[PDB]
Amino acid sequence: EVETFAFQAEIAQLMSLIINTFYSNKEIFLRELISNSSDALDKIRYESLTDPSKLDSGKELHINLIPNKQDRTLTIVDTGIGMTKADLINNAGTIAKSGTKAFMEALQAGADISMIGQFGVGFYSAYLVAEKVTVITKHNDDEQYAWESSAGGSFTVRTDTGEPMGRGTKVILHLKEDQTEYLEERRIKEIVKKHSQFIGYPITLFVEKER
Amino acid sequence: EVETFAFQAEIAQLMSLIINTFYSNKEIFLRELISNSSDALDKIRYESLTDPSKLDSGKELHINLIPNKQDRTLTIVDTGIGMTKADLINNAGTIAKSGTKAFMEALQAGADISMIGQFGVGFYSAYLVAEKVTVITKHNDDEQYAWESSAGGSFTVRTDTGEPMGRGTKVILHLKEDQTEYLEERRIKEIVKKHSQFIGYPITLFVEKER
Ligand SMILES: CN(Cc1ccco1)C(=O)c1cc(-c2n[nH]c(=O)n2-c2ccccc2F)c(O)cc1O
Ligand SMILES: CN(Cc1ccco1)C(=O)c1cc(-c2n[nH]c(=O)n2-c2ccccc2F)c(O)cc1O
Numbered sequence: 434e435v436e437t438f439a440f441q442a443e444i445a446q447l448m449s450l451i452i453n454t455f456y457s458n459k460e461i462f463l464r465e466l467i468s469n470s471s472d473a474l475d476k477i478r479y480e481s482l483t484d485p486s487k488l489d490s491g492k493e494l495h496i497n498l499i500p501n502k503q504d505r506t507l508t509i510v511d512t513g514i515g516m517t518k519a520d521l522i523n524n525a526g527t528i529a530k531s532g533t534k535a536f537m538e539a540l541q542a543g544a545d546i547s548m549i550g551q552f553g554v555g556f557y558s559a560y561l562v563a564e565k566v567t568v569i570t571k572h573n574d575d576e577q578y579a580w581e582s583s584a585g586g587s588f589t590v591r592t593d594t595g596e597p598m599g600r601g602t603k604v605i606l607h608l609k610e611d612q613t614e615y616l617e618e619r620r621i622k623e624i625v626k627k628h629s630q631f632i633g634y635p636i637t638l639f640v641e642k643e644r
Numbered sequence: 645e646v647e648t649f650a651f652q653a654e655i656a657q658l659m660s661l662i663i664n665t666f667y668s669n670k671e672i673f674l675r676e677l678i679s680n681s682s683d684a685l686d687k688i689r690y691e692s693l694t695d696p697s698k699l700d701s702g703k704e705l706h707i708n709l710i711p712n713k714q715d716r717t718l719t720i721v722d723t724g725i726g727m728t729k730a731d732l733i734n735n736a737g738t739i740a741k742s743g744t745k746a747f748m749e750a751l752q753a754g755a756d757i758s759m760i761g762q763f764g765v766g767f768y769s770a771y772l773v774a775e776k777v778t779v780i781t782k783h784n785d786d787e788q789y790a791w792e793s794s795a796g797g798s799f800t801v802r803t804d805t806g807e808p809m810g811r812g813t814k815v816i817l818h819l820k821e822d823q824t825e826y827l828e829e830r831r832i833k834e835i836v837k838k839h840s841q842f843i844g845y846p847i848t849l850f851v852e853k854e855r
Contacts, residue, residue, distance in 0.1 A: 475739065478739060526693060631746065631763065
């Protein structure tokens with residue numbers, strides 16, 4: 434049912450550095466997740482040009498930002514190419530390791546945590562604001578899967594029986610107690626305008642009804 | 645033998661804007677070409693993880709910068725995944741068109757030409773410094789091809805009978821008469837240090853012997 438995997442030492446060290454170090458400019462996590470979403474959307478759109486059947490699982494190519502004050506979650510949903518089980522399990526591999534080492538070496542040399550995206554490990558900036566990250570994904574060539582990590586040196590992968598998404602990836606950030614500003618409409622709007630103004634797909638910021 | 649194609653109106657308009665407008669910060673072309681090279685290198689390295697036979701065409705993953713004062717050419721060579729004939733012919737398609745329109749709209753709104761890479765059309769910044777660009781490419785699944793454009797609204801594609809490269813892409817910039825600074829060792833070293841310091845592959849700047 435649930436498979437548990439250990440992160441390689443370098444990635445676990447990176448996650449520990451991110452989830453703990455004193456760094457106030459945490460807003461940069463959103464640009465990194467939106468950029469990965471945009472890259473996945475480019476991937477499926479390219480495939481759709483020579484094969485219109487690749488969009489049978491959903492024609493719309495977009496990014497949705499869904500805050501939930503009750504659950505204390507910020508969800509980033511995209512209708513990109515998605516990830517197979519193998520993509521989830523092999524996501525933290527050889528290239529992620531080289532990028533982590535280079536990033537760590539850059540930080541020792543005076544670089545800033547906001548430069549994380551230049552090393553291909555931008556996703557891990559999610560741990561600046563989240564105590565746990567759940568990733569639900571669906572690729573045309575595989576079943577729906579849930580990946581999850583609380584940065585304790587391991588991650589889990591299981592088949593997902595939740596609401597079927599047609600195709601794409603949903604990143605659920607279970608926010609840290611002191612990071613609820615990232616659930617506010619004004620705050621999210623400010624960050625998207627500042628760092629993700631030129632993303633080539635519609636970014637819809639959902640609003641919440643009164644509880 | 646040689647096939648000639650017209651660029652869509654939007655891309656031809658972009659190339660004309662780049663090859664003509666007054667913009668002094670031309671050095672940004674190198675970061676764009678190196679970034680595309682790094683992306684192609686990531687692509688072949690990922691494939692090599694589950695299939696070591698993908699590297700039969702060459703194990704080394706690197707970027708070489710080769711100035712030639714005699715020919716007035718700056719060549720950017722990479723051993724990335726390369727491009728098939730279809731990749732060369734379809735390179736200026738639907739996504740390139742949307743990115744061009746968004747870029748043009750951003751420029752009208754006060755954006756700078758250095759932001760070109762955010763729209764997925766960074767390659768075209770080559771025309772800030774080059775009067776003509778020749779691209780030799782080899783993908784594992786196809787033969788060696790030469791793509792070429794002098795930004796006159798068309799490009800050519802032909803099979804390439806030159807020195808066989810194992811795999812990857814070679815971008816030959818035929819520099820404009822007043823852009824020979826990009827053939828100088830000190831100048832190229834400065835640009836690579838300023839804009840491409842964190843690229844995850846070795847960048848070798850070749851030096852020239854005395855003529
Ligand atoms: C969810 N994660 C982190 C993680 C934990 C487990 C596996 O990945 C991400 O980085 C991430 C991945 C994709 C994705 N879907 N399809 C695909 O090619 N990508 C992809 C895109 C850009 C770099 C890498 C990618 F895979 C996405 O749409 C959003 C994301 O936030
Ligand atoms: C040579 N051109 C311009 C053009 C004219 C005709 C076709 O392309 C480039 O952009 C370009 C492309 C690659 C490449 N090889 N394989 C692959 O996937 N890419 C690729 C990488 C990043 C975005 C797009 C890409 F295709 C490269 O290694 C270097 C390059 O400078």
